Amino acid sequence: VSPPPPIADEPLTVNTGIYLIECYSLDDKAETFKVNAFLSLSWKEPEAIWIPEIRFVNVENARDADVVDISVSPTVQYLERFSARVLSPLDFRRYPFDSQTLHIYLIVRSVDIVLAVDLEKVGKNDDVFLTGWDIESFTAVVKPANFALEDRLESKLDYQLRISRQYFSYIPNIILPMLFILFISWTAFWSTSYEANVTLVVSTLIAHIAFNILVETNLPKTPYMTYTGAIIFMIYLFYFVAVIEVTVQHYLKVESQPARAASITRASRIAFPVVFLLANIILAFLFF
Amino acid sequence: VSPPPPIADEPLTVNTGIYLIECYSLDDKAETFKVNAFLSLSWKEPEAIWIPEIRFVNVENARDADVVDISVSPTVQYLERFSARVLSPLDFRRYPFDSQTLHIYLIVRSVDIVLAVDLEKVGKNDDVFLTGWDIESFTAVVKPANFALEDRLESKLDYQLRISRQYFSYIPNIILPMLFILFISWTAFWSTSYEANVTLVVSTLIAHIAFNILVETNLPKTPYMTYTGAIIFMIYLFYFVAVIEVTVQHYLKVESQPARAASITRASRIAFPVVFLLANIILAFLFF
Amino acid sequence: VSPPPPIADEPLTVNTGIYLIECYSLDDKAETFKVNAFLSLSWKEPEAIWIPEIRFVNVENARDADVVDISVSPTVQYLERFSARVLSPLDFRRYPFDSQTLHIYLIVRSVDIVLAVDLEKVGKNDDVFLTGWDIESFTAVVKPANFALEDRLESKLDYQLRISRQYFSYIPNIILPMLFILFISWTAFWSTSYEANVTLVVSTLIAHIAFNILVETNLPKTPYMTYTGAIIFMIYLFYFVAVIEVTVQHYLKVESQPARAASITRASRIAFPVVFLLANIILAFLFF
Amino acid sequence: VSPPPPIADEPLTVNTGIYLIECYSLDDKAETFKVNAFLSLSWKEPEAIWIPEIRFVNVENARDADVVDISVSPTVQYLERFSARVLSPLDFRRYPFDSQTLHIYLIVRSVDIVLAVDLEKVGKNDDVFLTGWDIESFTAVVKPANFALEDRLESKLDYQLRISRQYFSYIPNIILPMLFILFISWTAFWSTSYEANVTLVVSTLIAHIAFNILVETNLPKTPYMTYTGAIIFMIYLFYFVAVIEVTVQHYLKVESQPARAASITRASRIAFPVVFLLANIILAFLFF
Amino acid sequence: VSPPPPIADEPLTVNTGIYLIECYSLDDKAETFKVNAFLSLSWKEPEAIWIPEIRFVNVENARDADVVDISVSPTVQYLERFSARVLSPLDFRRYPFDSQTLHIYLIVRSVDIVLAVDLEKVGKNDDVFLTGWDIESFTAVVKPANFALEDRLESKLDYQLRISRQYFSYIPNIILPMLFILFISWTAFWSTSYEANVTLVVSTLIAHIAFNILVETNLPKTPYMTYTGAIIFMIYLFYFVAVIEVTVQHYLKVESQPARAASITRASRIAFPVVFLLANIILAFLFF
């Protein structure tokens, strides 16, 4: 009913480890993800011993805990399965090419301790390999500066999981068709008729708006300006410039200046591919 | 089991403070936001002392409370972590440029007290800086006139958080492309052919409706008339006026009055940019 | 632990009142709204006296109750805060111009009573003025005929809140742009070219379908035929009639009958504004 | 604390009845509907007698029960209000014209009984008339063959509610505008110009896709092939055939065969109304 | 209160079986499905005997359990109804033609056992036949290598349900109309006019984007590249190639090279049907 009294040091290094079991959800819009796994505590029946009530910080509602096995040994092991939605922000600074770092902050209440880690206990389960994500590093750090509101010194032993998106699907499902729509838009330049070029640019503008609807159905729409948030803006800019160019060409052609009209057509034709590649490169450099 | 009896004054100024931890959600459509933070009470084990059961007013369902640390001293500190969705209305009177003030009304039940504040305890955590929002002021006021239904005098010590939106993304993701669509619409004026101008205005009207779909996916659609709710209406007005102008121009051109047709084209061309800027300025002045 | 025995009359008129605090939600699609307020009971510590367990009828799940103040006096007052989603149907017979009446049916279990009201206790809080709605009347009625399944005579003392929508936003955000789309559609009549009139009517039909998408994002889509459900149908009817008229005009023009073609154009031009106004008036009279 | 021992027959015919109060929701997409009503048990204070714990089969999560009145008589009545989402599948074999039968399977645990019904107790409340639905029959059947996993003989006394949709709104809000779009599509036939007929058919194909979006916002999208799932397919078929017909007509007209072109136009004009009516009749006969 | 002590073997083969009752939901987007059925345990009143607390692994939140019948015999049967959302991933590698295998991992806590199966007890209920799915096999395997974090040897006796989609609706509701849109797109080739072919290809590109919206409303959008994720990409590729082909044809026709223009038209006309069939066959072979 009480922690083991006799020790010269006030804190006890109870080995705390976590091993993933199944990431039930990764809610981008809710900005949190639901994790369902079990944690192991080594402290050296539900009330067989004094269980250090190690709590969590980044938690929506009190973790759905369930003791699995509390083994004793001439120390004690304690593995408990739990499900909890962790309120870890993830910055969609680069949505199709991300390096999001999921955090779990574990803090232990103190009476009459200090959290620790176990190298063997921790580790993502190979059979629990995540769907659509890749794991780069899975470490733990004892940083006591995480919280400063409480006067008493407390150290939060957080777990960091660096995760990068599998991006071999987004290139052929989101980014590339926008380029195809833009390419159809440019193909208006080689044509001549106003009555055809106008529809071939504005109908494809309809196409781009609808396609942005299609992507938005999946995107989380962070308040930042995403890398997607810039390529979309660049495409709107280029559609506006293309409509301006075709209108100028027709204005010259009706005002009997065909030479400058042809010059503008040639310049735009050899420019927009080049200037768009340059602009995309500039945005990539800014979002490297 | 009882509050400390001997004091000449019926109320005790138990220091009540709150420090944010993680704003789990800001649900515009639900008109509430979910806050997960811990509150500290200074009153001068779960049942170690008499905990003043300070309750909240703006709460959906009873706050998910969890005691963190109840320290005693030769007064007593009591820090408790809690998660609660606060039912604080926020007026989207100016959606892209807002100054919304989140409220939390704390009231203490009285038997045989008066809420107070602690300057040091309160304060937004720097590491808990919100995503997509900026904090202007974080104050507390003891206003007993908040509720008048109960005859007994009670004072609600509310916390006010003034928050303004980071608007460097909405200008390049919502407002500006609508202007680009409208600009493409105007570019029909310099043209001449009816069979081209008609499609160049109505196809871009399709574009504007679809783009309003794209924004609506994000907007909360308050029953007010938002600043967005006016610019959208103004754009529909200008598309209707543009279609009227082009139809009149063609009606004159087929009725053999080319001079007035050219006059109308020139007037509209030099007018709609100017009149639209004037109208947007007028709406801005009305929504300053 | 027992109700006060000695009284010649079996029921006791415990004064029951409710004062709104914050209408947390008004879910049109769910057909229920979530109310968070406190109720006061005057019956002449949680177990200080015998609390008449007055229950509710229109409740999704058992009300989230919380006692606030149970005061005693040489009678007893009992104010309790609660949150509950009330399953009160609201008929969207006229969506932009509604008079929906929210109901709350309170019934008291009887052993060894009769519900009552307090004029002073009841009343909407001025600071709790609802967002996007207006209150016309807030009354209470003791109608024992509400339920007849139980043989024992019981009276349900329901509270009625008559609420009408603020409609100064829907006219400039929903109804009017549909009229603008229809007006653009009509503007095809003054034109002559088939290749232009066809696109100017069917592209704007695209516009109307997309705009109905935009409204549907907000509408609840009741199984009735709403007033919106009729104006939409009327607009589809008028687009079909307009396409029929333009096709007939072109069929006559290619069949070398220009006189009747011009006659039909003039008739339709002077008719559709008039006949549409008449039809909208007829629908308004039917939905007065 | 125990059932009444002395009776020669092991089961007791405790009269079980249900009367609806408010169908809180009918979730098509979730394939379940939430019912909030009270059930009455006649068995011949919460622990006043032995309450036969009659449970339900088609239940998502344990029914939210609440005892209302347990009356005793020199038998005993027991009316309890409850809210529960019942997992009753409903087959959208004919979405606009359905005859869906909602089921509620009640089974009584046996120790040391047999469920029964009461004609007077059961019955839909007239004031609880459902919104957008009509009730055809409300019966109860004791069919012990419902479940066979348990060796011990048990009879499930299910309640059946036959409900048919009010279809006076779907004809003027879903089915008819699709016909109007198709009619606009056909009106291309009487025209002659390719540059006009092509847009008048494919723009209206855009219209049909968008309108299917509008309906899909409401439909549940069952994995069957609905009657809607066939009319939609038929409309796509007819748009494809119409585009084929107009392309063939233009191919003949440019290949200098105007006679066969006119013949094809006349044949299609007099055919597609007739063949579409025949095809819709065939689908109706298949889905009678 | 304790397991039956005297047995030479530490584990007891308590027969564990599950029989489905109603699959309440199959949430593709949530990647989990909600099952509501009852499980039977044969171990050789709630506390009549020692119930082996067999827990589950793939569970969102602790299973909503409810004991149904705990029968004793001179062994003991124990049937308990439960509802639980199982976190079983399903790979949408082939969305319209899938072979998804739902898993349920059952593990028994050990003190002072080994899970087993019963051939008769297990089995899908015929009256509980799933809606929109077909069952191929329903087996159980004792594989102790499922989890390796715990040092103590434990065997998880998982149940596997192989389920394949009824695909007689997706072919006539999703795949085929995309082919119809593409066919309308190709029908532009036989035509000649640029002003007509351009609209007949880009308007139908609008159609394809909107139709992808319609399908996306139903699809779960897995991060893989689905078979749908390839046919969609192929259709965008073919629209881009078709626009390129028509623009090249018009560029040649205005540059006075009609012979090569006609040659390109004929080649594309006889190619795109053939090359598209070949490409779809190649994708099918890759996704066999």
mmCIF file with all atom_site columns, N, CA, C and O in Angstrom, chain E residues 10-22:
data_model
loop_
_atom_site.group_PDB
_atom_site.id
_atom_site.type_symbol
_atom_site.label_atom_id
_atom_site.label_alt_id
_atom_site.label_comp_id
_atom_site.label_asym_id
_atom_site.label_entity_id
_atom_site.label_seq_id
_atom_site.pdbx_PDB_ins_code
_atom_site.Cartn_x
_atom_site.Cartn_y
_atom_site.Cartn_z
_atom_site.occupancy
_atom_site.B_iso_or_equiv
_atom_site.pdbx_formal_charge
_atom_site.auth_seq_id
_atom_site.auth_comp_id
_atom_site.auth_asym_id
_atom_site.auth_atom_id
_atom_site.pdbx_PDB_model_num
ATOM 1  N N  . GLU E 1 10 ? 0.087   -27.408 -16.097 1.00 0.00 ? 10 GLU E N  1
ATOM 2  C CA . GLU E 1 10 ? -0.204  -26.021 -15.738 1.00 0.00 ? 10 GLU E CA 1
ATOM 3  C C  . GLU E 1 10 ? -1.328  -25.413 -16.571 1.00 0.00 ? 10 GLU E C  1
ATOM 4  O O  . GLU E 1 10 ? -2.227  -24.788 -15.983 1.00 0.00 ? 10 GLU E O  1
ATOM 5  N N  . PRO E 1 11 ? -1.357  -25.540 -17.899 1.00 0.00 ? 11 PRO E N  1
ATOM 6  C CA . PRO E 1 11 ? -2.467  -24.959 -18.656 1.00 0.00 ? 11 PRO E CA 1
ATOM 7  C C  . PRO E 1 11 ? -3.658  -25.897 -18.776 1.00 0.00 ? 11 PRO E C  1
ATOM 8  O O  . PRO E 1 11 ? -3.531  -27.123 -18.793 1.00 0.00 ? 11 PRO E O  1
ATOM 9  N N  . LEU E 1 12 ? -4.836  -25.286 -18.856 1.00 0.00 ? 12 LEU E N  1
ATOM 10 C CA . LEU E 1 12 ? -6.090  -25.995 -19.076 1.00 0.00 ? 12 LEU E CA 1
ATOM 11 C C  . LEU E 1 12 ? -6.675  -25.556 -20.411 1.00 0.00 ? 12 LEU E C  1
ATOM 12 O O  . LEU E 1 12 ? -6.735  -24.357 -20.702 1.00 0.00 ? 12 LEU E O  1
ATOM 13 N N  . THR E 1 13 ? -7.103  -26.527 -21.217 1.00 0.00 ? 13 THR E N  1
ATOM 14 C CA . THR E 1 13 ? -7.612  -26.249 -22.561 1.00 0.00 ? 13 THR E CA 1
ATOM 15 C C  . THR E 1 13 ? -9.098  -25.889 -22.488 1.00 0.00 ? 13 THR E C  1
ATOM 16 O O  . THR E 1 13 ? -9.983  -26.644 -22.892 1.00 0.00 ? 13 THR E O  1
ATOM 17 N N  . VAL E 1 14 ? -9.360  -24.696 -21.956 1.00 0.00 ? 14 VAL E N  1
ATOM 18 C CA . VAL E 1 14 ? -10.720 -24.171 -21.932 1.00 0.00 ? 14 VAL E CA 1
ATOM 19 C C  . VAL E 1 14 ? -11.146 -23.870 -23.361 1.00 0.00 ? 14 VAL E C  1
ATOM 20 O O  . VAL E 1 14 ? -10.498 -23.088 -24.065 1.00 0.00 ? 14 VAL E O  1
ATOM 21 N N  . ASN E 1 15 ? -12.239 -24.489 -23.796 1.00 0.00 ? 15 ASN E N  1
ATOM 22 C CA . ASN E 1 15 ? -12.652 -24.380 -25.190 1.00 0.00 ? 15 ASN E CA 1
ATOM 23 C C  . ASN E 1 15 ? -13.209 -22.989 -25.459 1.00 0.00 ? 15 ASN E C  1
ATOM 24 O O  . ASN E 1 15 ? -14.237 -22.609 -24.894 1.00 0.00 ? 15 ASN E O  1
ATOM 25 N N  . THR E 1 16 ? -12.535 -22.231 -26.316 1.00 0.00 ? 16 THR E N  1
ATOM 26 C CA . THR E 1 16 ? -12.939 -20.871 -26.649 1.00 0.00 ? 16 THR E CA 1
ATOM 27 C C  . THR E 1 16 ? -13.492 -20.852 -28.066 1.00 0.00 ? 16 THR E C  1
ATOM 28 O O  . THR E 1 16 ? -12.815 -21.282 -29.005 1.00 0.00 ? 16 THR E O  1
ATOM 29 N N  . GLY E 1 17 ? -14.716 -20.351 -28.217 1.00 0.00 ? 17 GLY E N  1
ATOM 30 C CA . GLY E 1 17 ? -15.319 -20.230 -29.524 1.00 0.00 ? 17 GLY E CA 1
ATOM 31 C C  . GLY E 1 17 ? -16.075 -18.924 -29.637 1.00 0.00 ? 17 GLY E C  1
ATOM 32 O O  . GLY E 1 17 ? -16.486 -18.328 -28.641 1.00 0.00 ? 17 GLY E O  1
ATOM 33 N N  . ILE E 1 18 ? -16.243 -18.481 -30.877 1.00 0.00 ? 18 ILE E N  1
ATOM 34 C CA . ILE E 1 18 ? -16.994 -17.273 -31.183 1.00 0.00 ? 18 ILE E CA 1
ATOM 35 C C  . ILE E 1 18 ? -17.926 -17.557 -32.351 1.00 0.00 ? 18 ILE E C  1
ATOM 36 O O  . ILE E 1 18 ? -17.554 -18.250 -33.304 1.00 0.00 ? 18 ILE E O  1
ATOM 37 N N  . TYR E 1 19 ? -19.154 -17.058 -32.253 1.00 0.00 ? 19 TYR E N  1
ATOM 38 C CA . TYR E 1 19 ? -20.123 -17.130 -33.337 1.00 0.00 ? 19 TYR E CA 1
ATOM 39 C C  . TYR E 1 19 ? -20.665 -15.732 -33.579 1.00 0.00 ? 19 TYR E C  1
ATOM 40 O O  . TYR E 1 19 ? -21.158 -15.087 -32.649 1.00 0.00 ? 19 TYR E O  1
ATOM 41 N N  . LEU E 1 20 ? -20.574 -15.269 -34.819 1.00 0.00 ? 20 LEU E N  1
ATOM 42 C CA . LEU E 1 20 ? -20.993 -13.913 -35.132 1.00 0.00 ? 20 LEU E CA 1
ATOM 43 C C  . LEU E 1 20 ? -22.492 -13.752 -34.917 1.00 0.00 ? 20 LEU E C  1
ATOM 44 O O  . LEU E 1 20 ? -23.263 -14.711 -35.010 1.00 0.00 ? 20 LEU E O  1
ATOM 45 N N  . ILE E 1 21 ? -22.900 -12.522 -34.605 1.00 0.00 ? 21 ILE E N  1
ATOM 46 C CA . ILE E 1 21 ? -24.300 -12.175 -34.396 1.00 0.00 ? 21 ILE E CA 1
ATOM 47 C C  . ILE E 1 21 ? -24.735 -11.042 -35.315 1.00 0.00 ? 21 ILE E C  1
ATOM 48 O O  . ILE E 1 21 ? -25.750 -11.148 -36.010 1.00 0.00 ? 21 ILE E O  1
ATOM 49 N N  . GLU E 1 22 ? -23.990 -9.939  -35.319 1.00 0.00 ? 22 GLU E N  1
ATOM 50 C CA . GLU E 1 22 ? -24.287 -8.830  -36.223 1.00 0.00 ? 22 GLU E CA 1
ATOM 51 C C  . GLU E 1 22 ? -23.057 -7.939  -36.322 1.00 0.00 ? 22 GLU E C  1
ATOM 52 O O  . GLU E 1 22 ? -22.674 -7.308  -35.333 1.00 0.00 ? 22 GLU E O  1
#
